[PDB]
Subunit: 380 residues, 4 copies
Amino acid sequence: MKIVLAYSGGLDTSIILKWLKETYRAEVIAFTADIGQGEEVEEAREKALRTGASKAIALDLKEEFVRDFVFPMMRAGAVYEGYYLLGTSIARPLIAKHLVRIAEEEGAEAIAHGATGKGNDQVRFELTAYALKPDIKVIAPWREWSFQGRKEMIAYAEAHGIPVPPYSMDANLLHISYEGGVLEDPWAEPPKGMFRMTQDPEEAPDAPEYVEVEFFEGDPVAVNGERLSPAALLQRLNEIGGRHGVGRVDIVENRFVGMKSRGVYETPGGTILYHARRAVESLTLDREVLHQRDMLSPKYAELVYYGFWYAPEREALQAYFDHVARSVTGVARLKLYKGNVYVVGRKAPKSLYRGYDQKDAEGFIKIQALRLRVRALVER
Amino acid sequence: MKIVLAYSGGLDTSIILKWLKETYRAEVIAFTADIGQGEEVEEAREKALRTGASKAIALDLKEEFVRDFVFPMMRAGAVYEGYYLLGTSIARPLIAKHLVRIAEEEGAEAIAHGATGKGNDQVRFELTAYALKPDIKVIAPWREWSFQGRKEMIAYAEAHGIPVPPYSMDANLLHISYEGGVLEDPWAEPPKGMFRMTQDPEEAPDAPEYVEVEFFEGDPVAVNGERLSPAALLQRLNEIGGRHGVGRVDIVENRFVGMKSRGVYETPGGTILYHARRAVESLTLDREVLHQRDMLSPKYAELVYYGFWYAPEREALQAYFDHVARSVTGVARLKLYKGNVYVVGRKAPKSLYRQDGYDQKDAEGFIKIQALRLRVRALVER
Amino acid sequence: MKIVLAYSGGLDTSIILKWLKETYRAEVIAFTADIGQGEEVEEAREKALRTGASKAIALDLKEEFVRDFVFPMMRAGAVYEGYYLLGTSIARPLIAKHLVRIAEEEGAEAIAHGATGKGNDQVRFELTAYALKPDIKVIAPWREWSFQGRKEMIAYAEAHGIPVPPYSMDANLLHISYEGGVLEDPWAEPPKGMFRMTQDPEEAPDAPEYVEVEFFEGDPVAVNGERLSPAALLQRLNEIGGRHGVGRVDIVENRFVGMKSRGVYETPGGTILYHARRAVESLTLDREVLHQRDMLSPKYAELVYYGFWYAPEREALQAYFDHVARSVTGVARLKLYKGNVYVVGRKAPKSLYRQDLVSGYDQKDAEGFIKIQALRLRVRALVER
Amino acid sequence: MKIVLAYSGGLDTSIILKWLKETYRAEVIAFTADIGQGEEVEEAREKALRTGASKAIALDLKEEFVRDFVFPMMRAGAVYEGYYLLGTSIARPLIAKHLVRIAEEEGAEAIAHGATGKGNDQVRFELTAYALKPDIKVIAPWREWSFQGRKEMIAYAEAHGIPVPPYSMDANLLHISYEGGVLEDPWAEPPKGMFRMTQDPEEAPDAPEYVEVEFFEGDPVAVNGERLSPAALLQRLNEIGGRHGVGRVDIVENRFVGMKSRGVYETPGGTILYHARRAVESLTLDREVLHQRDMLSPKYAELVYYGFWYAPEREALQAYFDHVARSVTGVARLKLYKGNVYVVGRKAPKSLYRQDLVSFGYDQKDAEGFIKIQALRLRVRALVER
Ligand SMILES: Nc1ncnc2c1ncn2[C@@H]1O[C@H](COP(=O)(O)OP(=O)(O)OP(=O)(O)O)[C@@H](O)[C@H]1O
Ligand SMILES: Nc1ncnc2c1ncn2[C@@H]1O[C@H](COP(=O)(O)OP(=O)(O)OP(=O)(O)O)[C@@H](O)[C@H]1O
Ligand SMILES: Nc1ncnc2c1ncn2[C@@H]1O[C@H](COP(=O)(O)OP(=O)(O)OP(=O)(O)O)[C@@H](O)[C@H]1O
Ligand SMILES: Nc1ncnc2c1ncn2[C@@H]1O[C@H](COP(=O)(O)OP(=O)(O)OP(=O)(O)O)[C@H](O)[C@H]1O
């Protein structure tokens, strides 16, 4: 029996790698994906072999991530509950996609992940795992093992030679999320020094910095006149936005599984892209199209947040969003200053910006007012 | 014949006042509303009499503006095309509401306003005017007169004893908008020193300021523990927020009448209230209710923008938003710093947040059921 | 330990009554609700006492059913996936509501029901049970026991001496649903003679019958001039409509649990009420209000279908629907003829219809409206250059 | 100057043709489109010459109408205010399209139509024209002339020699609408003998008739096993459904321009197609996709009703609906009987229906977990209400 494990190299997945060998007497194949966590994925691939993996795979998926997940999601103008740019949500479908692919190539009947038994992550991983390969078997140790506490896990780890090292994290090219610990009290401001991807706004440059982003077809293709591949482009905007402390969010969100959770997110590059995209759309999109699109975005956002990426509903809405996005061509000019992003200019080859006279307006008014007058008259 | 005129005290409405008397051989009743334009409405009232009004009325409508228009709108989480807080839109229905009220009391058959014959304000004024009094007669001079140029209008003013004088503005308790002139080039950043209501972020305090806003029932009732009336509260948050340069928006918006226009808006108090409200809702509102509410907010925003305030659709939605907003009770703690507003804390008496009802096995069952239709889809695609 | 069982009186709930006693060795308070199944609930009550129940309650909830559940739902124009009028969905919440109330009075820690693990009902009972009393315990025998088939159950019943006997059904004041058995083949038409509430159109009167329904405030208050209570009014319309074979639906629906299911429903009075209301709304509701209401109807419908009646979302939407429904005051006239319902007329005290804007604006006005509405399209074409 | 007129062949457009000559002294190019009005369009074309047209064009547009307008609209499940299948609405865009095309080829400066100045049709004609040719000039005689009353127009007509004579009609392959006259009172039942496309339920066959419709990719492609082109298929279904009195609607609808209006519609083929399509969708469409599609249908419907066919919003929605419709492949079996259409069966090569999941991999215990997770927020809510 073989099992493909989503291995990140941490303590837990290392413990899980041992547990799987022991518990299922199976051969474990480790898979580590580089999606911009800023760690040396090769060190994880090696540590997996040291921990007992019968094979360790490590792939650079940054380009695929941005191009096939982040970009399509951004085209939809997806925002969860007013602020969340969904950094963790769009990433999971990618990992799971590869776990299933690898499992098929290696002839493995099962895949495994170390997402906890009470969070949303497990749902995200498995929803796409089941959607891509319906008969795959999933093993989620956090739902099957008996461990009573951390102390016992630490002890278990020491027993197996696994090296043991105030809040949880998750980082990738789109963002870094923080929760748990000091963050669990929604009335307590995040601690000083927690942020890693972005500079403290109070420590940001005293001079604002301008940046231009070009869109060709719904997708950003250049920064300050330099053409850049999808991953390279997000990276660049993370640097520029990060240096200024842009893209910070502090919310209490509604979980799909549990109840409410307090999360802090920094999405410098994506935050810039969000306003840059809308800046171009303000010249290129038709009014009614824009209004309909924005009324569908929230639905799309929750689908991504819940984990229904490879679900027919999300793909259906995507056809709509992509159709609209095809018109988004032009350049956005923004001004970055101490935590804030300001749209300062926009232009487009097919801008709709600058057919009737005043008498025309009077007629429009009269026709629009008719049902209101009748109603008023009827209220007698 | 009597005509009630929405008189602002400026050159154009003064010219309009003279124009109306002669053109219609009628007497004009001037009405000036104080909605926070930062002007002495009483001097406009006197100037009207001097300009020929048979009667001039000036009312302080700041409290009503915030209590009956701004708050109801904010409860709905209304935002037009991603950023516009509707500062100009919610103020028009209120002005027209009084014009029609005064016309009825004075026995006037018509009302008049000085909105341009080609813009959006005209629609706002008239849609509410007709909705409140179907038989009212509306006279929009800009759509009716023969003036062919600005210069001709000045000569007319000078001939009638009416005193004469980069972009145009509109200010009230919620915001100040800027449009036209140099702002007409969507690629050009607004000129230095244009903002009046908010300090430039570059000149804002080096020290961040924390502010707490209490919501009792969907509406903000206190700032930093101090109970404030609707207008006094909006005012207070404009002062606090303005000092930090909070609430600046630069957008090209879609108009109801013509095409697009580049507008710049500064809404310090409203911006703080926007995030504060959502902060309290994050603990008080149910997930499914929040999601449904946010999907209707845009529709509501466009109704307000287009001018359908006293319209049955807006009121039906308002019934929904008010039902939801009733649960928004609690306090939001925000941090202000150089142009930005950061939510740093929130609490509530009936918070649904328990940082802690089901076990791991439960989650697996949930996954299986949620995944069924997807698995069936996959097998069918073979 | 005490368990309150939603007891209907059939073989399954009877077996469950025995099973609960042997399995949990607790007292079982049986509860049978009269919601219009055309069944004598006292029989079930007594049959429950015989079967072992330590106590049996039988309540007449017809008026409550129609008044506090069917009516509010109808005000919203609720229709699931094009044709389902939610006959079974709005009933469950009512029952669950009483199960929890009873358990609270009897000091019972749990409630039980005989809905299967494959359906929506289990969700409806439980979602409302937990929403009304979070600490309640729910026992669903179909999900816990070992019976591997009909046969095993029949024997088990006889072992405990319990009376024993194509498709199964569910009936109440709103409709009768048929499902399973021969109905599982979506290509196969329901067998002839299956329907019970409606007469076969082929046997319906040769002369059309006209019926008038008065709505006062979003709810129907009279039929053909006779004022009738909510439950009484639904009954009358079932008789009138059933006679003509009105309201038959045959659909493959999507269950909340994940799979498709072939269902057949007959909702005579509801189908008449459905059209009667829209007919009155056509004169009393503003255009924009109507268009918004119709786009929200489907969401409300799935909420009810899934079991989220006592959920904040449904109640939030209800405030909107009730607000709009408040204006639905007037009368609808419909013609019933062999399975069909045709709206032939409608009137209302505050109708917005004036046969004069057809027989506050002129020709010139329309021209202007057209120019303003066309501007963005012309600019689009121009820019497409 | 040249003016391309949407000439229907009737009294009004005949008067208009004269009015255009006499008022604008323009060369009038008449255009009649056969979209299935059941009128020998060629007659109209000759009559236009007899009336003064310097050129008369008649085109058979049945196929284009169904394939490029009716089908795309049905693909979206478009229903205006619960009952209107938009028979008149989807036709206008097609006509205006040709009006504009003929104007360019003929080098004509303006186009004209005879929709009244009080209705929605004028909007439909013009939104389309302006959408395809922004520089086009439009002449709407009803909004420009001094005529007041049919008595007066009949005089002008007689004067010029144009032949002269309870409700107004409008027919095409999709339906026939009736409005005005004795129909204006919302409380009055329509008059016996009005309907033309459908047999009266009471006079319909005594035995029910079954019909099957196959959909391949969102569109109907065959009836009772016979492949049929878009126009021929609608025709066949009008014949079959008509004989049984199917597809009659009687509503008071909300107008875009006027206030409210009482309309009666008969759409036999369309009504069958509507229930057939949903029958095939019940097996081929995913639950969440269906629920989402149905919530958007009403918006698409008012877009069509208001005349925004060639508008960016409608085409954007169309992309959503076409994406969804692509999966609708299968056959629906319907029972026609005295005015009604009953769905009695449906099958599909890629049906998502699995009997094994409903009959007695799916594990009953999974439902409990599903239930508990779904119930959490409700329990917390109750507990907090304490
Ligand atoms: N405070 C107010 N009280 C009464 N009417 C007002 C007020 N503010 C605006 N209006 C009405 O709205 C129309 C004006 O717009 P805006 O406020 O954009 O006008 P202006 O051009 O700034 O002033 P003026 O008309 O004096 O030149 C006015 O002509 C007036 O009829
Ligand atoms: N009138 C009623 N009173 C109480 N509970 C009811 C009633 N009708 C249905 N129920 C509940 O819903 C569940 C039943 O469904 P249905 O009525 O579809 O079941 P059956 O399995 O067809 O009949 P039975 O349980 O009587 O053998 C029942 O097991 C019961 O717990
Ligand atoms: N088949 C067609 N070909 C060209 N234009 C048409 C056609 N059918 C309708 N129209 C246009 O739509 C307008 C008409 O509507 P309707 O058919 O409702 O008009 P009428 O005024 O009832 O008849 P008519 O004008 O022909 O006597 C017409 O005046 C005509 O310009
Ligand atoms: N880069 C990655 N490659 C493969 N799987 C990953 C990666 N990052 C996270 N996962 C998977 O996602 C889930 C984990 O989350 P998180 O990354 O929040 O876990 P941890 O518990 O923090 O990590 P670890 O146990 O590996 O130290 C499952 O553990 C883990 O298998």
